[PDB]
Amino acid sequence: LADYITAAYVEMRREAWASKDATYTSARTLLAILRLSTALARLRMVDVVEKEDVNEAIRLMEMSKDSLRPADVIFATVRELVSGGRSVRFSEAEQRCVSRGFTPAQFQAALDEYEELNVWQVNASRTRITFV
Amino acid sequence: SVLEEARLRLHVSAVPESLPCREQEFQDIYNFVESKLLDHTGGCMYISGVPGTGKTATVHEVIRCLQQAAQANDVPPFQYIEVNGMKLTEPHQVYVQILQKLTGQKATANHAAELLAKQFCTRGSPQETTVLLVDELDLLWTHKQDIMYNLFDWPTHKEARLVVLAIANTMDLPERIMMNRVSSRLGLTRMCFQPYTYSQLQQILRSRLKHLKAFEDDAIQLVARKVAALSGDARRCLDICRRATEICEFTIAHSMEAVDEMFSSSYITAIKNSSVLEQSFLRAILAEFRRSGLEEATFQQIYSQHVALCRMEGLPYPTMSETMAVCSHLGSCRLLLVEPSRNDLLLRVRLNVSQDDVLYALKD
Numbered sequence A: 001l002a003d004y005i006t007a008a009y010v011e012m013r014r015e016a017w018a019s020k021d022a023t024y025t026s027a028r029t030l031l032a033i034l035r036l037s038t039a040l041a042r043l044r045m046v047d048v049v050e051k052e053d054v055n056e057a058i059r060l061m062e063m064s065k066d067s068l069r070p071a072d073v074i075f076a077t078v079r080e081l082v083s084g085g086r087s088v089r090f091s092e093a094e095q096r097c098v099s100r101g102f103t104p105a106q107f108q109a110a111l112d113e114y115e116e117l118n119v120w121q122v123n124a125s126r127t128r129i130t131f132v
Numbered sequence B: 001s002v003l004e005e006a007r008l009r010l011h012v013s014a015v016p017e018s019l020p021c022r023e024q025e026f027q028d029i030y031n032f033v034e035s036k037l038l039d040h041t042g043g044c045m046y047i048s049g050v051p052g053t054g055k056t057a058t059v060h061e062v063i064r065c066l067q068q069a070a071q072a073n074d075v076p077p078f079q080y081i082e083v084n085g086m087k088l089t090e091p092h093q094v095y096v097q098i099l100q101k102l103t104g105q106k107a108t109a110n111h112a113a114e115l116l117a118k119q120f121c122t123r124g125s126p127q128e129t130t131v132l133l134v135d136e137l138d139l140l141w142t143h144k145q146d147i148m149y150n151l152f153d154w155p156t157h158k159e160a161r162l163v164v165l166a167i168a169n170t171m172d173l174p175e176r177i178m179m180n181r182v183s184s185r186l187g188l189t190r191m192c193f194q195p196y197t198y199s200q201l202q203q204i205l206r207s208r209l210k211h212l213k214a215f216e217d218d219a220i221q222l223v224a225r226k227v228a229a230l231s232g233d234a235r236r237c238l239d240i241c242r243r244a245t246e247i248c249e250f251t252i253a254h255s256m257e258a259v260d261e262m263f264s265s266s267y268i269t270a271i272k273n274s275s276v277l278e279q280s281f282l283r284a285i286l287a288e289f290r291r292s293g294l295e296e297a298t299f300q301q302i303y304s305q306h307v308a309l310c311r312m313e314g315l316p317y318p319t320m321s322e323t324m325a326v327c328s329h330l331g332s333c334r335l336l337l338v339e340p341s342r343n344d345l346l347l348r349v350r351l352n353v354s355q356d357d358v359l360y361a362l363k364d
């Protein structure tokens, strides 16, 4: 649970750094949340602290401080193949889109929908697409 | 040759006889003007549209059809007069132009206006219906608005027998440029020409190249689509097609080269072909801007940053005159902004291009 605790502490300290009116979240806050987790573990009568105790401690600290479409997915998939090139092969994009769990009909529908916006142009041979 | 024939067909001045792409607007104008010609009563219409929509061509074709109908003794005879606003040295001289077109008399601007007023307000001899075409209306503006008021008020008179069509690019003109009484005179008679859809552009291109197999459908579709997405103008489409033919003389590659050569900016390549000292000057400007955060900087701080960069790079120590000459050369090609005629060390410098473009040009 240390890694999750580290990530949660980083998130909380980043939030406290973004807000000027928040209390200074030094290592004392981490000590306090660790004490809260240990107290919760004692309360539940367990010799090992579980993630539920950490979640409850985070929730309590947050309450205390508070008291004060297929078209887009296919466009992103073909956007992943824009690594330094203006034109993308039709076969590669078709194979990659199908591997993501989309039927070729939805691929054609997404191609037409983003093609109406004229983001790109497709060759009639359906072999290459030049991105406008 | 086939390419030569395509070039001949695609020229701008090669006006077609009639394209049904605007047949609806043609029909509307054909009803309006026909009604104004049959009743021996004048009228006025305001037409606003972006350039390249074929407004002048459509009006001229309608005038051709009306003249043909008159030649076939179906419409009473009419006198046609055409004037262009931007082809006149002075605004008041339009009074002389119309008068000389109708009677050939030479008179002063005020006297020509008075004579035209007398002719159009007094019950004179029964004359043929007058068809007046005024081009580029917005350029006839005057602080007194007398010319515009007279132009759009004279056909209101019954004795005028005058039909006026005003072609302009801004549809807001009768609201924010024209005063209330004349705004109501042109009110509710505003024709707006929407830009051609890519289907319309493809139809126009196909009509240009009938019975000629010179271009592949893919190039044509892409050119029409770029035109739709950029301006929807037939003029630049014809220019792109001609350039594609020229490059083919030397596929989709030709159209792509035409579109990215006649539209793209040359700032990046100009910066790339710049000298080493100019690149160092640009880097010094960027560093000073990052240190300060302001978009204006005096020449002294830029000179200090340039000296520091030259010392870092091992370049020889530059003199103030050399840096000033380089800055003056850079300002000559409108890459910077400066007024070095009198001020030398206190010159404000502003970038003429975006910072990210400079970074993308200088990273390589």
Ligand SMILES: Nc1ncnc2c1ncn2[C@@H]1O[C@H](COP(=O)(O)OP(=O)(O)OP(O)(O)=S)[C@@H](O)[C@H]1O
Pocket (backbone or CB within 6 Å): B012, B013, B015, B019, B021, B022, B049, B050, B051, B052, B053, B054, B055, B056, B057, B058, B204, B234, B235
């Ligand atoms: N009906 C049409 N179909 C296809 N192309 C046309 C049509 N009418 C005109 N064009 C073309 O479009 C061009 C623009 O026509 P114009 O009438 O000169 O432009 P405009 O709409 O009057 O705008 P400006 O700024 O006054 S040139 C013409 O020179 C022709 O090449």
Ligand SMILES: [Mg+2]
Pocket (backbone or CB within 6 Å): B055, B056, B057
């Ligand atoms: Mg015109």
